[PDB]
Amino acid sequence: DIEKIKPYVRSFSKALDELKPEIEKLTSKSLDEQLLLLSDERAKLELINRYAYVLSSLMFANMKVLGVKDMSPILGELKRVKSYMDKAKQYDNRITKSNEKSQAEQEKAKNIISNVLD
Amino acid sequence: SENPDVLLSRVINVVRAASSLASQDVDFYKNLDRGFSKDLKSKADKLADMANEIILSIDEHHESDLWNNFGNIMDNLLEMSDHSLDKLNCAINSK
């Protein structure tokens, strides 16, 4: 009964310890330094969304442990971040579609070469 | 978590564990045991420090409070995000 809570606390505590080095790694330099070092715009978008994801997640985890009753405001930020990430996926799907089309043409070309000569 | 990105994996493990723990009867142990209550607050404070670490990474000028700070920063992050995606879409639609 009393012993029921302890594995939950242990699990949470272990998760925190594992996360801490990763946050240090993530923040080893400023966001602006990381962005200025990137040439690819899609990589910039991924990094920015990743920061928003990690930050709002920490805030959510913090508020759960503080035992906040009204979770609607922070869950709103999580919904926002998910929506933003889906916007990015939809751009990726469009890129993928044109990649596949390009791969299809190239596979066609190789077959033309290989086949007719055979 | 079997997320091949290590950071995202650690983040989701923390989020799920925090959620699981809070769904248990924490208030009951809070009343019964002072040590427990202080330990949770210590963990909450670790989370806030990590959030502040990220916030300092974003607002690099350094030559309710946490909550408001967090809200203003999220608006800044997602403004950058919209800017970046608008540029990506502009390029591909002009192509």
Curated annotation (Swiss-Prot), chain A:
It is found in: Nucleus. GO terms for biological process: exonucleolytic trimming to generate mature 3'-end of 5.8S rRNA from tricistronic rRNA transcript (SSU-rRNA, 5.8S rRNA, LSU-rRNA); maturation of 5.8S rRNA; nuclear mRNA surveillance; nuclear polyadenylation-dependent CUT catabolic process; nuclear polyadenylation-dependent rRNA catabolic process; poly(A)-dependent snoRNA 3'-end processing; post-transcriptional tethering of RNA polymerase II gene DNA at nuclear periphery; regulation of gene expression. It comes from the Eukaryota. GO terms for molecular function: DNA binding; double-stranded DNA binding; double-stranded RNA binding; enzyme regulator activity; protein-containing complex binding; RNA binding. Keywords: Exosome, Nucleus, RNA-binding, rRNA processing. Its main location: nucleus. GO terms for cellular component: exosome (RNase complex); nucleolus; nucleus. Belongs to the C1D family. Associates with nuclear form of the RNA exosome complex. Interacts with RRP4, RRP6, RRP45 and RRP46. Required for exosome-dependent processing of pre-rRNA and small nucleolar RNA (snRNA) precursors. Involved in processing of 35S pre-rRNA at the A0, A1 and A2 sites. Required for activity of RRP6 in 7S pre-rRNA processing. Also has a role in 3'-processing of U4 and U5 small nuclear RNAs (snRNAs). Acts as a mRNA export factor. Mediates mRNA degradation upon UV irradiation. Maintains genome integrity where it is involved in both non-homologous end joining (NHEJ) and homologous recombination pathway repair of double strand DNA breaks. During NHEJ, required for joining 3'-overhanging ends. This is Exosome complex protein LRP1. It comes from Saccharomyces cerevisiae (strain ATCC 204508 / S288c) (Baker's yeast). The chain holds residues 3 to 120 of 184 of the full protein.
Swiss-Prot record, chain B:
Disruption phenotype: Deletion mutant is temperature-sensitive. Impaired growth at 37 degrees Celsius. Impaired growth at all temperatures, nonviable at 37 degrees Celsius. Mutant is defective in the 3' processing of the 5.8S rRNA and accumulates a discrete species, 5.8S + 30, that is 3' extended by 30 nucleotides. Accumulates 7S RNA. Accumulates 5' external transcribed spacer (ETS) RNA. Accumulates extended forms of snR40 small nucleolar RNA (snoRNA). Accumulates U24 + 3 snoRNA. Accumulates poly(A)+ snoRNAs. It is found in: Nucleus, Nucleolus; Nucleus. It comes from the Eukaryota. Nuclear-specific catalytic component of the RNA exosome complex which has 3'->5' exoribonuclease activity and participates in a multitude of cellular RNA processing and degradation events. In the nucleus, the RNA exosome complex is involved in proper maturation of stable RNA species such as rRNA, snRNA and snoRNA, in the elimination of RNA processing by-products and non-coding 'pervasive' transcripts, such as antisense RNA species and cryptic unstable transcripts (CUTs), and of mRNAs with processing defects, thereby limiting or excluding their export to the cytoplasm. Component of the RNA exosome complex. Specifically part of the catalytically inactive RNA exosome core complex (Exo-9) which may associate with the catalytic subunits RRP6 and DIS3 in cytoplasmic- and nuclear-specific RNA exosome complex forms. Exo-9 is formed by a hexameric base ring of RNase PH domain-containing subunits and a cap ring consisting of CSL4, RRP4 and RRP40. RRP6 specifically is part of the nuclear form of the RNA exosome complex; the association appears to be mediated by Exo-9 and not by DIS3. Interacts with LRP1. Interacts with NPL3, NOP53 and PAP1. Present with 2160 molecules/cell in log phase SD medium. Belongs to the exosome component 10/RRP6 family. This is Exosome complex exonuclease RRP6.
